[PDB]
């Protein structure tokens, strides 16, 4: 098409369409000598055109030491504001990866996300974007959490002004919000005071459950697209993405497993499982934490958290 | 009935290709189901849901003021079926509601069958005398129908209903407007309710249903290890009865048995509780309890019977006392609590 | 910068036609004439117009503005001081609240009390709105509502007389029984298809009536617990309904009240009462309340909440309605 890359004219494009060449892959997956016999175009121009197209539309590798040095001063560790979870997570969670929190109703995923958002907004003074899909975000709880870390009203207001709230109730709204955030961050490369560092999706299950069922396959494609968006946001822009998920029990085995299926089981790079302590001894706040999946620690270690003491 | 709507020809062709018949058929499915069937996109599927939902009903605004004021347009909210006794009617604030299942539970010899017969007789009176000017349907499950007591009650009716003039009583054909059915199984009861009752109700030959002992087959066919099929059958039966009662504006009276209490259900200090569990209790509107105290009639000499209101959306929990004689069931004045 | 076609709500046929043609990114079709697009792809011009309209269809609020809005919007009082105290002030707007309990425990009384209370004038600390009641069981009796409204009117009159102001008298001039009864809109759904249809029609109704501040659906378990053997379809429908209700509550600044039923869970030869409709339904609501009898008193337990702490209080039902002590 005209304007896609230099050296392409509409006459050449139409002539190529005459001989069944339509897209970039079609032009690249061809032969120089074989194609330049049905119409007889310029011989050495085709290779230059294909080299240019490959230059624009192909990724390039990087030597190991270069990105080692780059990530040495780029990757950051953000504390969650809870000592036990920080010790379990090895001093916090790294940017550039996706973190998942699973658990049943009342487990405390929203509380953990709120504590993280407050700590990042106040302790580190960086922007946070909150995506809510089930109405679990309240400003009163955020104010209560902040009041336990500072007593200056102006400081609290400044911390609260650094948290952005977005409501998305179906999959398409969430995808649009994520794409808009990607575009905004891409346009906001030069700026450094205002760029979002942490993104929280309150519940990915609430927007994918209605699409799953029957003999169809659209829901799987949509959730894979959502996973691709989250991975791109986490890796390319060097951000920290935290999502929450529901818990399910296997009918044939009676084992607790994350929801959304085996295809979703491969998405997160780190998973944390919350639980109640056998009822007794967990009348409130006392919750059971575990490391269901990780890439830097052995799996199975357990810790202890108390929601009541965070406020 | 799908062609009465206003849709684009492509949408109509697609839904016809999907073998969709009626508006209920399309509202039965979900969004993803219609997406997989019609091979459409979300906006036009949403528009189809818009059109179907508007077709089922719409453009009508109903307020509580209209329900409270327009009495003739809404007989359900203002009309009650009398029990034949002023005291019992005062206890029930008019009588039985015209929409919803009413339970009557109690131990043996409490007097439930007498109340059922009295209601079957009283349903035939004119509007100003508490009746609905229609007959009744009686379904027997445990024993045979007591025709001798019914004959005695019909003979004694002019002496019980003192308010009604005798001339109007003389023209009432009591026995010809009561229908009797017999059931020996759960499946037989379900088939009877599904087939024979709606035919009688639609033609207008009856405006009252008496299932009588609903617990009799369930107590004998399902054990403690088959609770799920029993719950399924109970839910189906309750749904069918509620649908019929709502459609034809006719009360449904069910008679239940009790079991030893031996309290999540609010039956702490009571000896007996209604049977069939919570699944059956979830389907009811008004719950009553008839009781007899054999340890107090040993002192009084005469039987001591009380009727109690366990629960109702509009009635406080209260009770009264009644007696049974040759006329029928009659309440005792000045005993309501 | 690149947006894929899969993320847009298009029909599978036109999407697969575009994919087979060679279009991969959203911006690729932003510079193609609809006539030429129809010629190359093979779709009709109406399809091209529709997809071009759809593709060009996909603000900034901070926690401070959200806190200000939360403070400005009030709560709905239940005339039970303990319940209001443990709820944070009352039933919060823009949230979904669920009530569970055994038969004859007082869910419908709470629904009627909330429907009456949503209309209290702001001079007395109310919201001054209107209510929508959706009945799926036929348990809505007008006489009980009349009793509750009369009791509320008497209470407000006594408060105004004690205060001896001037604004209170003007506010109570228009707080009569007729207006209270006329500001409640009633719907009756006899099947789950009818319930879905009414819920679908709700947004336009709320657009027409902008003063509504409460939506009550008295009974969601009954339509879904009979003559429905395909449980996957039931779960899909329930999830869709929950998403629609939370979207409605957030968009129209309402309070959504749902009533559930209780079932029996049999384990270790022991019977416990649990809310019905499965485990995945527990995530649907935002706040969950459970009513039960202890010995003869009625208890309300804040089973789940994202802002408060689990507690338990005492209430009772009077001839005047939902009360305390
Ligand atoms: N201020 C508070 N003080 C103490 N505990 C609190 C406070 N606020 C909330 N909680 C606790 O939070 C619990 C619920 O946690 P949370 O809202 O994070 O659940 P969740 O896992 O997100 O649930 P859902 O699946 O329903 O969205 C409650 O059981 C309550 O005990
Ligand atoms: N002609 C009559 N005169 C007076 N009392 C009578 C007469 N016929 C029956 N009774 C009374 O009816 C009582 C039993 O009533 P009924 O047959 O309605 O019981 P029920 O509650 O249906 O019991 P069950 O569980 O056995 O069906 C007896 O105690 C008896 O005193
Ligand atoms: N007019 C009234 N006066 C006093 N108490 C009443 C009145 N109407 C109903 N009640 C009581 O309130 C309760 C209503 O419970 P209900 O709303 O039916 O709960 P559910 O809908 O969960 O069964 C009943 O137990 C009844 O005893
Ligand atoms: Mg939550
Ligand atoms: Mg009998
Ligand atoms: Mg009710």
What is the residue-wise DSSP string for A63-94? -HHHHHHHHHTT--EE--S-HHHHHHTTSSEE
Distance CA A39, CA C33 (A): 27
Distance CA A114, CA C211 (A): 33
Nearest CA in chain C to A108: C306
Residue C15: inside a domain? no
Known binding site: residues of A? 103-110
Which ligand 1 atom is at minimum distance from the Cα of A246? 25
Distance CA C93, CA A238 (A): 37
Distance CA A285, CA A292 (A): 21
| Residues A100/A297, Cβ–Cβ less than 8 Å | no
Q: Ligand 1: which residue has its CA nearest to atom 13?
A: A106
| Cβ atoms < 10 Å from Cβ of B35 | 22
| Experimental approach | cryo-EM
Distance (Å) from the alpha carbon of C145 to chain A's nearest alpha carbon: 31
Distance (Å) from the alpha carbon of A249 to chain B's nearest alpha carbon: 21
Listing DSSP states for B294-326 in one string gives HHHHHHHSS--EEEEEEE-SS--S-EEEEEE-S
Chain B CB within 8 Å of residue C234 CB: no
Distance (Å) from the alpha carbon of A192 to chain B's nearest alpha carbon: 40
Distance CA A263, CA C44 (A): 36
Task: Tell me how many domains chain C contains.
Answer: 1
Q: How many residues does this entry show for chain A?
A: 311
Residues of chain A numbered 211-240 and touching chain C (CB < 8 Å):
212-214, 218, 221-222, 225
B54 lines ligand 2 (CB under 6 A): no
Alpha helices, DSSP H, located in B133-267: 147-160, 166-170, 186-203, 215-221, 227-248
Structural domain boundaries, residue C232: 63-323
The answer to whether C102 is annotated as binding is yes
B261 lines ligand 2 (CB under 6 A): no
Closest C-alpha to B14, from B39, B35, B48: B39
| Residues C44/C38, Cβ–Cβ less than 8 Å | yes
| Residues B191/B197, Cβ–Cβ less than 8 Å | no
**Sheet-wide strand order for B286-292:** B178-182, B135-140, B206-213, B252-256, B101-106, B286-292, B305-311, B319-324, B329-331
Q: What is the CATH number of the domain that holds C181?
A: 3.40.50.300
A311 lines ligand 1 (CB under 6 A): yes
Distance CA A241, CA A199 (A): 5
Closest C-alpha to C250, from C30, C143, C96: C96
CB-based contacts of A266: which residues, under 8 Å, 6+ apart? Answer: none
At C269 the three-state DSSP class reads: coil
Tokens of A98: 């996706």
Query: What are the backbone dihedrals phi and psi of residue B102, each rounded to the nearest 5 degrees, phi first?
Result: -115, 125
C292 lines ligand 1 (CB under 6 A): no
Closest C-alpha to B142, from B95, B199, B182: B182
C280 lines ligand 1 (CB under 6 A): no
Tokens of C287: 């706040």
Distance CA B48, CA B26 (A): 9
Residues of chain B numbered 310-329 and touching chain C (CB < 8 Å):
310-311, 313-314, 316
Q: Are strands C312-318 and C298-304 parallel, antiparallel or unpaired?
A: antiparallel
Tokens of B57: 């009903």
| Residues B106/B112, Cβ–Cβ less than 8 Å | yes
At B52 the three-state DSSP class reads: helix
Q: Which of chain B's residues have a Cβ under 8 Å away from the Cβ of C222?
A: 282
| CA angle at A28 for the pair A23 and A30, rounded to the nearest 5° | 105
Distance CA C33, CA C29 (A): 8
Task: Give the CA-trace dihedral at B10, B11, B12, B17, to 10 degrees.
Answer: 90
**Resolution for this experimental structure (Å):** 2.7
Question: At C97, which helix (H) or strand (E)?
Answer: strand C96-101
Alpha helices, DSSP H, located in C228-294: 231-252
| Residues A166/A132, Cβ–Cβ less than 8 Å | yes
Distance CA B36, CA B314 (A): 47
Best of C151, C297, C317, C323 for a ligand 3 pocket test (most atoms within 8 Å of beta carbon): C317
The alpha-carbon radius of gyration of chain B (Å, integer) is: 24
Token pair 């119409």 is found at A39
Q: Do A213 and C88 touch (CB under 8 A)?
A: no
Q: Which of chain C's residues have a Cβ under 8 Å away from the Cβ of B50?
A: 200
Q: What sign does the CA torsion over C138, C139, C140, C141 have?
A: positive
| Residues B63/C185, Cβ–Cβ less than 8 Å | yes
Listing DSSP states for B243-295 in one string gives HHHHHHT--EEEEE-EEE---TTS-TT-SEEESSHHHHHTT-SEEEEEEE-HH
Å from CA of C311 to ligand 2 middle: 50
Å from CA of B182 to ligand 5 middle: 14
CB-based contacts of C57: which residues, under 8 Å, 6+ apart? Answer: none
Contacts 24+ apart (CB under 8 A), A71-78: A71/A96, A74/A238, A75/A238, A78/A116, A78/A120, A78/A124, A78/A197, A78/A198, A78/A240
Burial class (CB in 10 A: 0-12, 13-18, 19+), C211: exposed
Closest C-alpha to A132, from A98, A165, A164, A105: A165
Chain B CB within 8 Å of residue A214 CB: yes
Report residue A27 CA to chain centroid gap: 34
Tokens of C43: 């779709």
Q: How far is CA C101 from CA B239, C107, C258, C262, C317, in A?
A: 20, 7, 12, 6, 15
Residue B314 has its nearest CB partner, among C144, C196, C237, at C144
Question: At C143, which helix (H) or strand (E)?
Answer: helix C142-163
Q: Which of chain A's residues have a Cβ under 8 Å away from the Cβ of B42?
A: 172
| CA angle at C77 for the pair C153 and C305, rounded to the nearest 5° | 165
At C92 the three-state DSSP class reads: strand
Q: Are strands A270-276 and A256-258 parallel, antiparallel or unpaired?
A: unpaired
Question: At A33, which helix (H) or strand (E)?
Answer: helix A32-35
Distance CA A146, CA B321 (A): 64
Residue C11: inside a domain? no
Q: How far is CA A58 from CA A46, A97, A183, A187, in A?
A: 17, 24, 21, 22
Distance CA B135, CA C28 (A): 75
Q: Are strands B252-256 and B206-213 parallel, antiparallel or unpaired?
A: parallel
Q: How far is CA B251 from CA A124, B99, B134, B213, C38, in A?
A: 69, 6, 12, 16, 63
Tokens of B222: 């399902």
Tokens of A161: 């002004």
| Cβ atoms < 10 Å from Cβ of A292 | 18
Report residue A271 CA to chain centroid gap: 13
CB-based contacts of A292: which residues, under 8 Å, 6+ apart? Answer: A102, A258, A271, A272, A273, A299
Distance CA A107, CA A45 (A): 64
Q: Do B32 and A215 touch (CB under 8 A)?
A: no
Q: Which of B29, B35, B40, B46 to mutate to test the interface with A (most CBs of A within 10 A)?
A: B35
| Cβ atoms < 10 Å from Cβ of A79 | 17
A111 lines ligand 1 (CB under 6 A): yes
Query: What are the backbone dihedrals phi and psi of residue C312, each rounded to the nearest 5 degrees, phi first?
Result: -160, 135
Tokens of C303: 């089973």
Closest C-alpha to A121, from A233, A40, A197: A197
Q: Given this structure, which CATH class describes domain A64-305?
A: alpha beta
Distance CA C96, CA A135 (A): 8
Nearest CA in chain B to A212: B32
Distance CA A109, CA A115 (A): 10
CB-based contacts of B277: which residues, under 8 Å, 6+ apart? Answer: B227, C264
At A284 the three-state DSSP class reads: coil
At B75 the three-state DSSP class reads: helix
Q: What crossing angle do the helices spanning C192-208 and C231-252 adopt, rounded to 10°? A: 10
B317 lines ligand 3 (CB under 6 A): yes
Distance CA C288, CA A105 (A): 10
């Amino acid at each position: 098409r005209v304007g896609l890359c230099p050296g392409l004219t509409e006459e050449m494009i139409q002539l190529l369409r005459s001989h069944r060449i339509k897209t970039v892959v079609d032009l690249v997956s061809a032969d120089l000598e074989e194609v330049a016999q049905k119409c007889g175009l310029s011989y050495k121009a085709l290779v230059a055109l294909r080299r240019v197209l490959l230059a624009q539309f192909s990724a390039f590798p990087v030597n190991g030491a270069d990105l080692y040095e780059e990530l040495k001063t780029s990757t950051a560790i953000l504390s969650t504001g809870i000592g036990s979870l920080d010790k379990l997570l090895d001093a916090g969670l790294y940017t550039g990866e996706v973190t998942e929190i699973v658990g049943g109703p009342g487990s405390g995923k929203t509380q953990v996300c709120l504590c993280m958002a407050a700590n990042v907004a106040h302790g580190l003074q960086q922007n946070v974007l909150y995506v809510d899909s089930n109405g679990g975000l309240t400003a009163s709880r955020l104010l209560q959490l902040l009041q336990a870390k500072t007593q200056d009203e102006e400081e609290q207001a400044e911390a609260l002004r650094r948290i952005q709230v977005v409501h998305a109730f179906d999959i398409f709204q969430m995808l649009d919000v994520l794409q808009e955030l990607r575009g905004t961050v891409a346009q906001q490369v030069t700026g450094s005071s205002g760029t979002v560092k942490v993104v929280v999706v309150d519940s990915v299950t609430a927007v994918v459950s209605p699409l799953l069922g029957g003999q169809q396959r659209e829901g799987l494609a949509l959730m894979m697209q959502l996973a691709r968006e989250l991975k791109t946001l986490a890796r390319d822009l060097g951000m920290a993405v935290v999502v929450t998920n529901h818990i399910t029990r296997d009918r044939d085995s009676g084992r607790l497993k994350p929801a959304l299926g085996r295809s979703w089981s491969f998405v997160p790079s780190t998973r944390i499982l919350l639980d109640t302590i056998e009822g007794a001894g967990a009348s409130g706040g006392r919750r059971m934490a575990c490391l269901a999946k990780s890439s830097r620690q052995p799996t199975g270690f357990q810790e202890m958290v108390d929601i009541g003491t965070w406020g | 009935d799908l062609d009465l709507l206003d849709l684009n020809p492509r949408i109509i062709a697609a839904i016809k290709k999907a073998k969709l018949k009626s508006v209920k058929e399309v509202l039965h499915f979900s969004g993803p189901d219609l997406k997989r069937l019609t091979n459409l996109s979300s906006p036009e599927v949403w528009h189809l849901l818009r059109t179907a939902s508007l077709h089922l009903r719409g453009s009508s605004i109903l307020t509580a003021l209209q329900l409270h004021q327009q009495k003739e347009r809404f007989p359900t909210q203002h009309q009650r079926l009398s029990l034949g006794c002023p005291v019992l009617d005062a206890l029930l604030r008019g009588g039985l509601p015209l929409d919803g299942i009413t339970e009557l539970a109690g131990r043996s010899s409490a007097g439930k069958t007498q109340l059922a017969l009295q209601l079957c007789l009283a349903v035939q009176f004119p509007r100003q005398h508490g009746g609905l000017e229609a007959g009744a349907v009686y379904i027997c499950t445990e024993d045979a129908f007591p025709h001798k007591r019914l004959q005695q009650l019909m003979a004694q009716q002019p002496r019980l209903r003192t308010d009604v003039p005798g001339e109007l009583l003389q023209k009432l054909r009591f026995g010809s407007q009561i229908f009797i059915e017999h059931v020996a199984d759960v499946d037989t009861l379900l088939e009877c309710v599904n087939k024979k009752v709606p035919v009688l109700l639609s033609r207008g030959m009856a405006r009252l249903v008496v299932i009588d002992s609903v617990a009799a087959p369930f107590r004998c066919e399902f054990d403690s290890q088959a609770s799920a099929p029993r719950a399924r059958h109970l839910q189906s039966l309750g749904a069918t009865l509620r649908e019929l009662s709502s459609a034809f504006q006719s009360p449904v009276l069910c008679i239940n048995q009790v079991t030893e209490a031996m309290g999540p259900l609010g039956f702490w200090d009571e000896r007996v509780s209604p049977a069939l569990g919570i699944t059956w209790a979830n389907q009811l509107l008004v719950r009553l309890l008839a009781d007899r105290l054999r340890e107090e009639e040993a002192a009084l000499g005469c039987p001591a019977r009380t009727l109690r209101v366990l629960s109702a959306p509009h009635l406080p929990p209260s009770s009264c006392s009644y007696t049974i004689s040759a006329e029928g069931v009659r309440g005792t004045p000045g005993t309501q609590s | 910068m690149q947006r894929d076609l899969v993320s847009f709500p298009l029909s599978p046929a036109v999407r697969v036609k575009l994919v087979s043609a060679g279009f991969q990114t959203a911006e690729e079709l932003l510079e193609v004439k609809p006539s030429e697009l129809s010629k190359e792809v093979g779709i009709s011009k109406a399809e091209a117009l529709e997809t071009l309209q759809i593709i060009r269809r996909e603000k900034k609020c901070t926690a401070l503005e959200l806190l200000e809005q939360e403070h400005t919007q009030g709560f709905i009082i239940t005339f039970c001081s303990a319940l209001d105290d443990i709820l944070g002030g009352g039933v919060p707007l823009m949230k979904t609240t669920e009530i569970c309990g055994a038969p004859g425990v007082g869910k419908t009384q709470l629904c009627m009390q909330l429907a009456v209370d949503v209309q209290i004038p702001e001079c007395f600390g109310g919201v001054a709105g209107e209510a929508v009641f959706i009945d799926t069981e036929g348990s809505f009796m007008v006489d009980r509502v009349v009793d509750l409204a009369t009791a509320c009117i008497q209470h407000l009159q006594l408060i105004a007389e004690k205060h001896k102001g001037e604004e209170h008298r003007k506010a109570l001039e228009d707080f009569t029984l007729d207006n209270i009864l006329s500001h409640i809109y009633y719907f009756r759904c006899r099947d789950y298809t009818e319930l879905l249809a009414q819920v679908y029609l709700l947004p336009d109704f709320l657009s027409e009536h902008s003063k509504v501040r409460l939506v009550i659906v008295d009974g969601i378990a009954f339509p879904f617990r009979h003559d429905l053997d395909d449980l996957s379809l039931r779960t899909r429908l329930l999830n869709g309904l929950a998403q629609q209700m939370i979207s409605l509550a957030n968009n129209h600044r309402l309070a959504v009240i749902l009533t559930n039923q209780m079932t029996t869970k049999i384990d270790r030869n022991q019977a416990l009462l649990v809310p019905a409709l499965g485990e995945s339904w527990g995530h649907a609501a935002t706040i969950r309340l459970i009513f039960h009898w202890d010995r003869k008193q009625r208890l309300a337990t804040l089973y789940k909440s994202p802002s408060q702490k689990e507690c338990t209080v005492l209430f009772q039902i009077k001839p005047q309605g939902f009360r305390d002590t």
